[PDB]
């Protein structure tokens, strides 16, 4: 059994691309991420998503954006995609000016809080560290 | 009723606790691989199987190159977290 993906629109693909961080963060510029965001925009365009790229958002602007997206009418959309490109820690993504709990972002789309996405796939794609361990690999 | 946490999928670039790697010119290993597998397989494979190809591509085709020995020759495995209740196909 498989999700209904023949609604009139495949849905939104939100891309939050954070490259430049306030010096208060002590966090380096993320060279290469513009290439990522452009690749994602073209990829999801070919999948018939309505793509919205946003760049260099604070933690408050991320929360705001997600709240606003979550209160849109998704009735005619098959799914929702959010791509986050930034620095991170376990459970955390960084706005330009500081960290944000990933749970605070995804909670806006819970089945009881975003009724027009109830029963529809909500995909979060997260390019960000989750700690500071390194995998040395095995031959 | 359904669970309020149902029908989420979190495609993480790396395993819990680990760094995630990015190339200053080509982009992050994970996004490069994700876009390439979606381009190659979105009309062919279910989404979880596409992400499994992304896992293999990140795991086998990338290894870090660093002038700092501490960060040199390192590897990465992405982490698929699925609370989905159905198969997901981007084709008809």
């Amino acid at each position: 059994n498989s999700y209904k993906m023949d609604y009139p629109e495949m849905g939104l693909c939100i891309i939050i691309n954070n490259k430049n961080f306030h010096k208060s963060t002590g966090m380096t510029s993320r060279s290469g991420t513009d290439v990522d965001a452009a690749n994602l925009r073209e990829t999801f365009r070919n999948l018939k998503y309505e793509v919205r790229n946003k760049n260099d958002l604070t933690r408050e602007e991320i929360v705001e954006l997600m709240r606003d997206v979550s209160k849109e009418d998704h009735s005619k959309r098959s799914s929702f995609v959010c791509v986050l490109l930034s620095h991170g820690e376990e459970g955390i993504i960084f706005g330009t000016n500081g960290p944000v709990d990933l749970k605070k972002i995804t909670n806006f789309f819970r089945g009881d809080r975003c009724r027009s996405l109830t029963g529809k796939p909500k995909l979060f794609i997260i390019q960000a560290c989750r700690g500071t361990e390194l995998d040395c690999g095995i031959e | 009723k359904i669970p309020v946490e149902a029908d989420f999928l979190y495609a993480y670039s790396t395993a819990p606790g680990y760094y995630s790697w990015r190339n200053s010119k080509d982009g992050s290993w994970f996004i490069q691989s994700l876009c390439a597998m979606l381009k190659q397989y979105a009309d062919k494979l279910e989404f979880m199987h596409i992400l499994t190809r992304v896992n293999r591509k990140v795991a086998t085709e990338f290894e870090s190159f660093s002038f700092d020995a501490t960060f040199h020759a390192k590897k990465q495995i992405p982490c698929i977290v699925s609370m989905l209740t159905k198969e997901l196909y981007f084709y008809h």
């Binding site: 380096t28 993320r30 060279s31 290469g32 930034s86 620095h87 991170g88 390019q127 960000a128 560290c129 | 670039s13 760094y19 995630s20 790697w21 990015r22 190339n23 200053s24 010119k25 992050s28 870090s64 190159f65 660093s66 960060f71």
Partner: peptide, 5 residues
């Protein structure tokens, strides 16, 4: 150049 996020 490879870098961590």
């Amino acid at each position: 150049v490879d870098a961590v996020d």
